[PDB]
Coordinates of N, CA, C and O in Angstrom, one line a residue:
Chain A
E20 N 139.6 82.4 62.2 CA 138.8 83.3 62.8 C 137.4 82.8 62.0 O 136.8 83.9 61.7
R21 N 137.0 81.6 61.8 CA 136.2 81.2 61.1 C 135.0 80.3 62.2 O 133.9 80.4 62.0
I22 N 135.6 79.7 63.4 CA 134.8 79.3 64.2 C 133.9 80.2 64.8 O 132.6 79.9 65.3
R23 N 134.2 81.4 65.2 CA 133.7 82.5 65.9 C 132.6 83.2 65.0 O 131.7 83.6 65.4
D24 N 132.6 82.6 63.6 CA 131.7 83.2 62.6 C 130.8 82.0 62.1 O 129.6 82.4 61.6
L25 N 131.0 81.0 62.6 CA 130.1 79.8 62.4 C 129.0 79.3 63.5 O 128.1 78.6 63.3
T26 N 129.6 79.6 64.7 CA 128.9 79.1 65.9 C 128.7 80.0 67.0 O 129.4 81.4 67.0
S27 N 128.0 79.8 67.9 CA 127.9 80.7 69.2 C 128.1 79.8 70.4 O 128.0 78.5 70.6
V28 N 128.6 80.4 71.6 CA 128.8 79.8 72.7 C 127.7 79.8 73.5 O 126.8 80.6 73.9
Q29 N 127.3 78.5 74.3 CA 126.2 78.4 75.0 C 126.4 79.2 76.5 O 127.3 79.1 77.1
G30 N 125.4 79.8 76.7 CA 125.2 80.9 77.8 C 125.5 82.3 77.5 O 125.4 83.2 78.1
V31 N 126.4 82.4 76.4 CA 126.7 83.7 75.9 C 125.6 84.2 75.1 O 125.8 83.8 73.8
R32 N 124.5 84.7 75.4 CA 123.5 85.1 74.5 C 122.9 86.6 75.0 O 123.3 87.3 76.0
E33 N 122.1 87.2 74.0 CA 121.6 88.5 73.9 C 120.3 88.5 74.6 O 119.5 87.5 74.1
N34 N 119.8 89.4 75.4 CA 118.4 89.4 75.8 C 117.9 90.9 75.3 O 118.5 91.5 74.6
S35 N 116.3 91.0 75.2 CA 115.8 92.1 74.8 C 115.1 92.9 75.7 O 114.3 92.3 76.8
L36 N 115.4 94.3 76.1 CA 114.6 95.3 76.7 C 113.8 96.1 76.2 O 114.1 96.6 75.2
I37 N 112.6 96.4 76.8 CA 111.7 97.3 76.5 C 111.3 98.4 77.4 O 111.5 97.9 78.5
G38 N 110.9 99.5 77.0 CA 110.4 100.5 78.1 C 109.5 101.4 77.3 O 109.5 101.5 76.1
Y39 N 109.2 102.4 78.2 CA 108.2 103.7 77.9 C 108.9 104.8 78.4 O 109.4 105.1 79.2
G40 N 108.7 105.9 77.3 CA 109.3 107.2 77.7 C 108.7 108.6 76.9 O 107.9 108.2 76.1
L41 N 108.9 109.4 77.4 CA 108.7 110.7 76.6 C 109.9 111.5 76.1 O 110.9 111.7 76.5
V42 N 109.6 112.1 74.9 CA 110.9 112.7 74.2 C 110.2 114.0 73.9 O 109.2 114.5 73.5
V43 N 111.1 115.2 74.5 CA 110.9 116.4 74.5 C 112.1 117.2 73.7 O 112.9 116.8 73.2
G44 N 111.5 118.5 73.4 CA 112.4 119.3 72.6 C 112.1 119.3 71.1 O 112.8 119.7 70.3
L45 N 110.9 118.8 70.8 CA 110.6 118.9 69.2 C 110.0 120.2 68.9 O 109.6 121.0 69.8
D46 N 110.2 120.4 67.6 CA 109.7 121.7 66.8 C 108.3 121.7 66.4 O 108.0 122.0 65.4
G47 N 107.4 121.5 67.5 CA 106.1 121.5 67.1 C 105.5 120.1 66.4 O 104.5 120.1 65.7
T48 N 106.6 119.3 66.5 CA 106.2 118.0 65.7 C 106.1 116.8 66.6 O 106.4 115.6 66.2
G49 N 105.5 117.0 67.8 CA 105.2 115.9 68.8 C 103.8 115.3 68.7 O 103.1 115.7 67.7
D50 N 103.3 114.7 69.7 CA 102.0 114.3 69.7 C 100.9 115.4 69.8 O 101.2 116.5 70.2
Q51 N 99.8 115.1 69.3 CA 98.6 116.0 69.4 C 98.1 116.1 70.9 O 97.4 117.1 71.3
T52 N 98.4 114.9 71.5 CA 97.6 114.8 72.9 C 96.3 114.6 73.1 O 95.8 114.6 74.3
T53 N 95.6 115.2 72.1 CA 94.1 114.8 72.2 C 93.7 113.5 71.7 O 92.7 113.1 72.2
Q54 N 94.5 113.0 70.8 CA 94.0 111.7 70.4 C 95.0 110.7 71.1 O 94.9 109.2 71.0
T55 N 95.9 111.1 71.9 CA 96.9 110.3 72.8 C 96.7 110.8 74.2 O 97.5 111.6 74.7
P56 N 95.8 110.2 74.9 CA 95.7 110.7 76.3 C 97.0 110.2 77.1 O 97.3 110.8 78.2
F57 N 97.5 109.1 76.9 CA 98.6 108.5 77.7 C 99.7 109.6 77.8 O 100.5 109.5 78.6
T58 N 100.1 110.2 76.7 CA 101.3 111.4 76.6 C 100.9 112.2 77.8 O 101.9 112.5 78.7
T59 N 99.8 113.0 77.9 CA 99.6 114.0 78.8 C 99.4 113.2 80.2 O 99.8 113.9 81.4
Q60 N 98.9 112.0 80.4 CA 98.9 111.4 81.6 C 100.2 110.9 82.0 O 100.5 111.2 83.3
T61 N 101.1 110.5 81.5 CA 102.5 110.2 81.9 C 103.2 111.5 82.0 O 104.2 111.6 83.0
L62 N 103.0 112.6 81.3 CA 103.6 114.0 81.7 C 103.2 114.4 83.0 O 104.2 114.7 83.9
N63 N 101.9 114.4 83.3 CA 101.4 114.7 84.5 C 101.9 113.8 85.8 O 102.4 114.2 86.7
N64 N 102.3 112.6 85.4 CA 102.7 111.5 86.5 C 104.3 112.0 86.6 O 104.7 112.2 87.8
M65 N 105.1 112.4 85.6 CA 106.4 112.8 85.8 C 106.5 114.1 86.6 O 107.1 114.5 87.6
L66 N 105.5 115.2 86.4 CA 105.5 116.4 87.0 C 105.2 116.3 88.5 O 105.7 116.9 89.5
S67 N 104.2 115.4 88.7 CA 103.6 114.9 90.1 C 104.8 114.2 90.8 O 105.1 114.7 92.0
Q68 N 105.6 113.5 90.2 CA 106.9 112.9 90.9 C 108.0 114.0 91.2 O 108.6 113.9 92.1
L69 N 108.1 115.0 90.2 CA 109.1 116.2 90.5 C 108.4 117.0 91.5 O 109.1 117.9 92.0
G70 N 107.1 117.1 91.8 CA 106.7 118.2 92.8 C 105.7 119.1 92.3 O 105.1 119.8 93.1
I71 N 105.1 118.8 91.1 CA 104.3 119.9 90.5 C 102.8 119.1 90.2 O 102.8 118.1 89.6
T72 N 101.8 119.5 90.9 CA 100.5 118.8 91.0 C 99.4 119.6 90.0 O 98.9 120.4 90.5
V73 N 99.4 119.2 88.7 CA 98.4 120.0 87.9 C 97.0 119.4 88.0 O 96.9 118.3 88.2
Chain B
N59 N 117.9 130.6 109.3 CA 117.9 130.0 108.0 C 116.8 128.9 108.0 O 116.7 128.3 108.9
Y60 N 116.1 128.8 107.1 CA 114.8 127.8 106.9 C 115.2 126.6 105.8 O 114.4 126.0 105.5
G61 N 116.5 126.6 105.7 CA 117.1 125.5 104.8 C 116.6 125.8 103.2 O 116.1 126.7 102.7
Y62 N 117.1 124.8 102.4 CA 116.9 124.7 100.9 C 115.3 124.8 100.7 O 114.5 124.0 101.2
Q63 N 114.8 125.6 99.8 CA 113.4 125.9 99.3 C 113.2 125.7 97.9 O 113.8 126.8 97.1
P64 N 112.5 124.7 97.4 CA 112.3 124.7 96.0 C 111.6 126.0 95.2 O 110.8 126.4 95.9
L65 N 112.1 126.4 94.3 CA 111.4 127.4 93.5 C 109.9 127.4 92.9 O 109.1 128.0 93.1
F66 N 110.1 126.1 92.1 CA 109.0 125.8 91.1 C 108.1 125.0 91.7 O 107.1 124.7 91.0
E67 N 108.6 124.1 92.6 CA 107.6 123.0 93.1 C 106.7 123.6 94.0 O 106.6 124.4 94.7
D68 N 105.5 123.0 94.0 CA 104.2 123.3 94.7 C 104.5 123.1 96.2 O 105.3 122.3 96.7
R69 N 104.0 124.1 96.9 CA 104.2 124.2 98.4 C 103.6 123.2 99.1 O 102.3 122.9 99.2
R70 N 104.1 122.1 99.5 CA 104.0 121.0 100.4 C 104.4 120.8 101.9 O 105.5 121.4 101.9
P71 N 103.7 120.3 102.7 CA 104.3 120.1 104.0 C 105.5 119.0 103.9 O 105.1 118.1 103.1
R72 N 106.6 119.3 104.5 CA 107.5 118.4 104.3 C 108.2 117.9 105.8 O 108.9 116.8 105.7
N73 N 108.0 118.8 106.7 CA 108.7 118.4 108.0 C 107.7 118.8 109.0 O 106.6 119.1 108.9
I74 N 108.2 118.3 110.4 CA 107.4 118.3 111.4 C 106.9 119.8 111.6 O 107.9 120.7 111.7
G75 N 105.7 120.2 112.0 CA 105.3 121.6 112.1 C 104.8 122.2 111.0 O 104.2 123.3 111.0
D76 N 104.9 121.7 109.7 CA 104.5 122.3 108.7 C 102.9 121.9 108.7 O 102.1 121.0 109.2
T77 N 102.2 123.1 107.9 CA 100.5 123.0 108.0 C 100.1 122.6 106.4 O 100.9 122.5 105.6
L78 N 98.9 121.9 106.5 CA 98.2 121.4 105.4 C 96.7 121.6 105.6 O 96.2 121.6 106.8
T79 N 95.9 122.1 104.5 CA 94.7 122.2 104.5 C 93.9 120.8 104.1 O 94.0 120.3 103.0
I80 N 93.0 120.5 105.1 CA 92.1 119.2 104.8 C 90.7 119.9 104.5 O 90.0 120.3 105.4
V81 N 90.3 119.5 103.3 CA 88.9 119.7 102.9 C 88.1 118.5 103.3 O 88.0 117.4 102.5
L82 N 87.2 118.6 104.4 CA 86.3 117.4 104.9 C 85.4 117.4 103.9 O 84.2 118.2 103.9
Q83 N 85.3 116.4 103.3 CA 84.0 115.9 102.5 C 83.9 114.4 102.3 O 84.4 113.8 101.5
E84 N 82.8 114.1 103.4 CA 82.5 112.7 103.6 C 81.0 112.6 103.4 O 80.3 113.4 103.6
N85 N 80.7 111.5 102.3 CA 79.3 111.0 102.0 C 79.3 109.6 101.9 O 79.6 109.0 100.7
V86 N 78.7 108.8 103.0 CA 78.7 107.3 102.9 C 77.3 107.1 103.2 O 76.6 107.7 103.9
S87 N 76.7 106.1 102.4 CA 75.4 105.7 102.3 C 75.2 104.3 101.9 O 75.8 103.9 101.1
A88 N 74.9 103.4 103.0 CA 74.8 101.9 102.7 C 73.3 101.5 103.2 O 72.7 102.1 103.9
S89 N 72.8 100.6 102.5 CA 71.5 100.1 102.9 C 71.3 98.6 102.4 O 72.2 98.3 101.5
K90 N 70.3 97.9 102.9 CA 70.2 96.6 102.7 C 68.7 96.3 103.1 O 68.4 96.8 104.0
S91 N 68.1 95.2 102.4 CA 66.6 94.9 102.5 C 66.4 93.5 102.1 O 67.0 93.2 101.0
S92 N 65.6 92.9 102.6 CA 65.2 91.3 102.2 C 63.7 91.2 102.8 O 63.5 91.6 103.6
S93 N 63.0 90.0 102.1 CA 61.9 89.6 102.5 C 61.7 88.0 101.9 O 62.4 87.6 101.0
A94 N 60.7 87.4 102.6 CA 60.4 86.2 102.1 C 59.1 85.8 102.6 O 58.5 86.5 103.5
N95 N 58.2 85.1 101.8 CA 56.9 84.6 102.0 C 56.5 83.4 101.4 O 57.3 83.0 100.5
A96 N 55.6 82.8 102.1 CA 55.2 81.3 101.7 C 53.6 81.5 102.0 O 53.2 81.9 103.1
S97 N 52.8 80.7 101.1 CA 51.3 80.6 101.3 C 51.0 79.2 100.7 O 51.5 78.7 99.8
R98 N 50.0 78.7 101.3 CA 49.2 77.4 100.9 C 47.8 77.7 101.2 O 47.6 77.7 102.3
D99 N 46.8 77.3 100.2 CA 45.5 77.2 100.4 C 44.8 75.9 99.8 O 45.2 75.7 98.5
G100 N 44.1 75.1 100.8 CA 43.5 74.1 99.8 C 42.1 73.7 100.6 O 41.8 73.9 101.6
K101 N 41.2 73.4 99.4 CA 39.8 73.3 99.7 C 39.4 72.2 99.1 O 39.8 71.8 97.8
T102 N 38.5 71.2 99.9 CA 38.2 69.9 99.0 C 36.8 69.7 99.6 O 36.5 70.0 100.8
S103 N 36.1 68.9 98.7 CA 34.6 68.7 99.2 C 34.0 67.4 98.1 O 34.6 67.2 97.1
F104 N 33.2 66.9 98.8 CA 32.3 65.9 97.9 C 31.0 65.7 98.6 O 30.7 65.5 99.8
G105 N 29.9 65.7 97.7 CA 28.7 65.6 98.4 C 27.7 64.9 97.2 O 27.9 65.0 95.9
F106 N 27.1 63.9 97.9 CA 25.9 63.1 97.1 C 24.6 63.7 97.5 O 24.0 63.2 98.5
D107 N 24.0 64.5 96.5 CA 22.7 65.0 96.9 C 21.6 64.1 96.7 O 20.7 64.1 97.9
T108 N 21.6 63.2 95.6 CA 20.6 62.3 95.5 C 21.4 61.0 95.1 O 22.2 60.8 94.3
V109 N 21.2 60.0 96.0 CA 21.8 58.6 96.0 C 20.9 57.7 95.2 O 19.7 57.4 95.9
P110 N 21.3 57.1 94.1 CA 20.4 55.9 93.8 C 20.3 54.8 94.6 O 21.0 54.6 95.6
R111 N 19.5 54.0 94.7 CA 19.3 52.8 95.4 C 20.4 52.1 95.5 O 20.7 51.4 96.7
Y112 N 20.9 51.5 94.4 CA 21.9 50.3 94.3 C 23.3 51.0 95.0 O 24.0 50.3 95.2
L113 N 23.2 52.3 95.0 CA 24.5 53.1 95.9 C 24.2 53.3 97.3 O 25.1 53.8 97.8
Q114 N 22.8 53.4 97.6 CA 22.5 53.7 99.1 C 23.7 53.1 99.9 O 24.1 53.9 100.8
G115 N 23.8 51.8 100.3 CA 24.8 51.3 101.2 C 26.0 51.7 101.3 O 26.7 51.6 102.3
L116 N 26.6 52.3 100.1 CA 27.8 52.8 100.0 C 28.0 54.2 100.1 O 29.0 54.9 100.5

């Protein structure tokens, strides 16, 4: 059980994924949204997608 | 029966026969102008009021 600990197999590799999201349900410890316009912009985007146009 | 109707979603037209309000507000204005000019003035003169004798023939 040492070769598996010393080498890696060609083609058997890991990639990296990134994305943007919103986290809700905080107890008043979220963004101020006055210094972060993108939070409100993306919340409006989500609401518009769901059918609400602010 | 008028089918499923969302509760909190804004009232939007979804099917044939639904109504929608259009606020006509058009304001289009285009303009263009150009010009070109060219001028040329030329004056030339030469006069011998008094000609000395040795220059007379010329």
